[PDB]
């Protein structure tokens, strides 16, 4: 079967007479799967007047694109909007729509929004707006029919709209949507609101008296309780639902391949609710993802970035696993950063498919230039170091594109690995839209500074990666006990509220022997904002009252104390923590303990336990201590702490983040070898399996082309590689064995390799 | 004539048995010079209790240190604050002395500070604070005398306090100081008050009558008038020079070197203030400066940083060539950055002595540990990849500092070739204030975003540096017409206000023959907020009034065209320009003219220029538009623009800040050769200049060492050099020639080496 291994090249954005030209590069470099948009606006340029097929511009030949295509023997995934971002004039839509029919935009609380503003937010469930979008679905969808592979063309998936967001505007609470249709008296507020909840439940939620529905004005401002703050996040997401919806029973019509949607509503938490909606819908959906780190800036792919990339790729792991759909990075970023130097990029893409995603698109795969009249966050050009360059270049991060697609085509044993880490993040969605808000209401004694605290460059996730912990992520509301339960250890950051639906379930987690680890508090109200202390009855552990600092000069560094842990700084207050066991002082203040309850336990810290790199590595060595205690053992071991291992079964990915040289043993399955990373860069090294008939018990090298009897292997970050096999290497051709023992079937072998690149013969 | 190459090993923070092992190790790096702290809350850790010899811990033998430097052949860089920041407890304050006189601590508006909270601030000027200041010093500054360079000892140099900044306060208009000694009736503000303003002066720019000056109450928010919070700000940085003034008087007393400051008021363009003091109370103190970029994350020095790099280099140089003192950096950032990989750690460290910076200490050099009771920012640990670790090791960023020391040390001529270029940026210290708060007041038409528009990524200085345009800083205030008249080609970044000084100097500067940039509008109002426009009067220019976006989804895209410039894109509103030239447009409104005035010209662009990178380059090539149409030459050319080059008279300073393959001529004083610099770093090249008896007309790598009819080149960018001189190379140690060709007595050679390094013999 087809690893999908594709770029970007919108047909739109670069000459007809380069189409071939730079496909047949596409080609050269191992991609086998073309991406495009189809824009709206590109192709109806004036409101009744459709042009597919070049009448009025040579970029408006799509048959004639889908054709070339199909000619050089691509798939094609196709993106038809209507909203495709794009970087494109109005995400797609045409100005004469927003122009004729004005109303149909979406509306601050004060009002009108300015209209110079980017990609025009619109009123997704406006029927002008759903009306225009028909007549687009009508006039794309039979071009696209007649080119489904399954009517032997070479479209195989169609994708709906673009990470649909309320058009950017779902991260600003009260931005978005105030127009008379959502908001007018029994307007779709009002009906969700019915839909949703009983006018005692709201009156109740609120603390406000309600004679009916109709008099519920949507929140406005951070003065309003946090529920309906929360609610009026949750309805503009039940907005871009049914609208998702809208576009999906259409589509339907029309393609009998697989329907996609990328980073529905730009969260991830939220998926929550993208999950619940398609599963009562029915709608059979393909989520894919997407991944981006620097804008109009150098590339900055570094160690950093950990935490946020093993928590995205676990979200998107934990929803594809329940939707039971392949993975897919339908954006992985090449472009729109100023240089991408191939080690950085390299250490994005190729940790790509250890975390679980093994179809990749690139894009910008082919650099281009935006048509006058449809320029916007670019003006005229659309070549930002995409890796073809407008005038045919290829640039740096080709390289590592190339490799891992042979990597990925020859090894069908690692497509059918899997990431199965003992430890998860426990991910409560209601923390995410206070996060991104930046909201914290008056009360709370914890600060919503997640970016900080969880995520970043210091945050626990990238401490835990940085830590050789590889984590899945589990939703704490939709988990049941017997899913958790899959986890030896569950790590939760906790505020000031937690549902009750949540709390009872992690209490039955850790009595039925899950370990939790909790910080930097624990909570103290529910769901609804009213004191609650399950959590702390439960586990009989008392949590002192600290307001956590906001201002950066008034947030105290703290030194914390533990067993072999001298002082081991943290931010931001500390709190007394009593029951159960010591593990974590402040002097004789106590701010860490661990307790047993049936035949689990929690640790509960009272701070925020954050990445911090140092010759004393107190804070890696604090993360070792808390596995300890809770009898958490790594399915691996490393000489070298800094040699990132990821164990997905019959292959390791083994990871030097830095550009500083890396040596040390690692032991998995039984065996034992020597690695030497000289710079940043990743391996895939095979343990115990069948490769071409020959058995490799391991290669210190990524596998990268298959023979009769042969193996090419590629060492980029070394000159010396070490493989043992069940037999006996006749020939070494790029390479000389400097070494090698046999032991009864077992040859282990030392090769020293001028380049990257050798071939062996059994 | 002796280069400082410097760096910092605090002994307080190293066993004392590793003190000889580290500074050999330092010897071996070619570091001549050692800095250090001498913390008061270490050296008198119980009130009256002073101990120098290491009585009470090693670690407290400062004599023994200053022995051993001086056996060892190092000069001393002594910094004993009495504040040291230094990521040390109080930042070296003893805890003693808080606790018994809690008096002295700074207070904000509504009160005391919390007393958890960092470098616990202290209100400078009180006497118990002054008391106690005066006693340490007058225990540590008896073994200072004693070391002295001029009594035999190694010390050379006295530094006072540490980068004062009321205790990193200063950042937050009303965060300090309200103690009860500043702000009481006839208090030291009502003092400053009365001192510098007639009490009418401050009634017209408040807008307030007032009977008395004790009833102005110190400013307490961002609803105050703009001119009395800037008063408040100026009066903070007033108590702060009187602070140095009583330290430098007190130090006088007992020292005959040099005596020195870092960066006052952690500020730049409020070193107007600093200068116009120690001018007025005739104080002979040596401004030095330092270069930090990267905290708690990974080192991250790429092309991003050079708008700032350019701007800060440039206030330092403009500062010191008025004070005529000589430049240092005493802290070039070697740590407290989780990797400093070498290449980027290069392009800092190389462009220091390019832009005017050719004495440099590195800090931490050292890496150590912090005694318990003494941590604060790190815990335990003080090795945070210093270039020597805690082991012993030494880490990759030893490099680059190995081979600018072999450079500087070796060639005399360089520090006294001057970095004089045409263009130069005008700052303005008001808008410092107003961008470190973030605040914009109500009325005002421009965003405060300066680290957006002018300094950051994307700054339009940062486009300056990447088009291939060094420049100068100088102070709009304190500069004359005549220093203007120096510069071809002033840019000015415009607020809405702008002295009536200012306006006028900058209108003589057009009509004397300058050329003015200004940009993204003109100013409406004087320095009391006042409407005023004799810039847009003399000019004859209009610009539309439109008030810049601050919510980041509100701020647009625009492009904006001119001739051979298709949609240059631009964020933020656009204003109309009317009057003059039309040179840029947006559809059909122009958006930028240039008039001429005098002798000389303005451009005014309606819109923040800003660096973007892109195929289509537009951004770099509108300032060679705008340099064209002002008629500015650069002083040398490169065929491929992406070869950043510094002309120094007799040196180029060549830099590729990206790691990407470079290629392309330079052509500079009538010679012309080919560069190839294959990742990111730099190369100091001789221009028609005697290196010990060989006379060079240029060579295409840094000279690194001189003997008897020999030099040694080093070459990390490259396996191939071209070198041109009047004579004939007898012998090439390290590799060979390649190519050669003779013009009369001229040879031109191709030198093929293996390695970075080879030497030629004529
Ligand atoms: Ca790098």
């Not at 090894?411 to 880490?421: A, G, W």
């Not at 071409?692 to 090298?701: H, M, Q, R, S």
């Amino acid at each position: 079967r087809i690893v999908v291994y594709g770029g970007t090249l919108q047909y739109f954005r670069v000459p007809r007479n380069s189409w071939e030209r730079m496909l047949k590069k596409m080609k050269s470099h191992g991609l086998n799967t073309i991406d495009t948009y189809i824009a709206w606006n590109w192709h109806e340029p004036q409101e009744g007047l459709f042009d597919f097929t070049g009448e009025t511009h040579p970029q408006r030949d799509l048959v004639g694109f889908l054709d070339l295509a199909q000619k050089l023997g691509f798939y094609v995934i196709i993106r038809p909007g209507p909203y495709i971002c794009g970087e494109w004039k109005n995400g797609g839509i045409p100005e004469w729509l927003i122009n004729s029919h004005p109303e149909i935009l979406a509306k601050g609380p004060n009002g009108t929004l300015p209209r110079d503003i980017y990609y025009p937010p619109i009123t997704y469930l406006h029927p002008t707006y759903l009306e225009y979008v028909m007549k687009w679905y009508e006039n794309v969808f039979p071009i696209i029919k007649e080119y489904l592979y399954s009517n032997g063309g070479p479209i195989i998936n169609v994708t709906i709209d673009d990470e649909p967001s309320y058009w950017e505007t779902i991260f600003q609470a009260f931005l978005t949507d105030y127009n008379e249709i959502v908001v007018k008296e029994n307007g779709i507020w009002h009906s969700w609101l019915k839909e949703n909840y009983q006018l005692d439940e709201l009156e109740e939620r609120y603390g406000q008296k309600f004679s009916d529905y109709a008099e519920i004005v949507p929140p406005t401002s951070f003065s309003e309780p946090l529920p309906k703050i929360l609610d009026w996040h949750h309805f503009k997401i039940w907005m871009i639902n049914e609208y998702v919806r809208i576009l999906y029973e259409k589509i339907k019509k029309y393609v009998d391949v697989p329907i996609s949607i990328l980073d529905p509503y730009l969260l991830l938490a939220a998926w929550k609710e993208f999950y619940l909606y398609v599963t009562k819908h029915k709608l059979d959906i393909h989520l894919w993802t997407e991944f981006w780190y620097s804008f109009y800036r150098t590339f900055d792919f570094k160690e950093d970035r950990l935490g946020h990339l093993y928590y995205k790729t676990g979200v998107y792991r934990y929803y594809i696993n329940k939707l039971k759909t392949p993975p897919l990075s339908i954006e992985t970023q090449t472009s729109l950063a100023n240089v991408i130097e191939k080690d950085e990029a390299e250490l994005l893409y190729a940790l790509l498919p250890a975390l679980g995603i093994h179809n990749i698109n690139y894009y910008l795969y082919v650099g281009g230039e935006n048509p006058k009249g449809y320029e916007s966050h670019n003006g005229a050009t659309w070549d930002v170091y995409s890796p073809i360059g407008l005038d045919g270049r290829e640039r740096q991060h080709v390289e590592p594109i190339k490799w891992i697609g042979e990597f990925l085509k020859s090894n069908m044993d690692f497509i059918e690995s899997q990431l199965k880490p003992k430890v998860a993040f426990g991910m409560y969605e209601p923390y995410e839209a206070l996060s991104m808000w930046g909201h914290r209401p008056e009360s709370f004694e914890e600060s919503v500074n997640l970016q900080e605290y969880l995520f970043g460059e210091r945050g626990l996730l990238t401490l835990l990666a940085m830590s050789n912990v590889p984590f899945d992520v589990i939703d704490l509301e939709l988990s049941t006990v017997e899913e958790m339960l899959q986890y030896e250890q569950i790590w939760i950051y906790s505020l000031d509220f937690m549902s009750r639906e949540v709390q009872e379930k992690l209490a039955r987690y850790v009595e039925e022997g899950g370990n939790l680890v909790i910080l930097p508090t624990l909570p103290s109200l529910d769901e609804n904002m009213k004191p609650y202390t399950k959590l702390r009855d439960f586990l009989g552990i008392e949590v002192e009252k600290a307001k956590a600092r906001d201002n950066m000069r008034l947030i105290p560094y703290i030194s914390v104390d533990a067993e072999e842990i001298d002082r081991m700084v943290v931010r931001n207050v500390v709190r007394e923590v009593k029951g159960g066991k010591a593990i974590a002082w402040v002097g004789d203040k106590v701010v860490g303990v661990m307790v047993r309850k049936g035949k689990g336990s929690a640790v509960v810290l009272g701070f925020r336990l954050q990445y911090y790199s140092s010759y004393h590595d107190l804070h890696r060595k604090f993360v070792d201590k808390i596995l300890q205690l809770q009898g958490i053992e790594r399915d691996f071991e490393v000489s070298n702490r800094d040699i990132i291992v990821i164990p997905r079964g019959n292959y390791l990915v083994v990871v030097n983040p830095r550009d500083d040289k890396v040596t040390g043993k690692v032991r998995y399955r039984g065996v034992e070898f020597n690695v030497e990373l000289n710079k940043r860069g990743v391996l895939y090294i095979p343990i115990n399996v069948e490769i071409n008939g020959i058995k490799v018990l391991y290669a210190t090298a990524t596998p990268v082309g298959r023979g009769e009897g042969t193996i090419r292997f590629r060492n980029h970050l070394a000159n010396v590689t070490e493989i043992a096999i069940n037999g006996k290497i006749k020939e070494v051709s790029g390479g000389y064995i400097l070494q090698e023992k046999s032991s009864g079937e077992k040859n282990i072998y030392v090769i020293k390799h001028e380049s990257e690149t050798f071939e062996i013969r059994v």
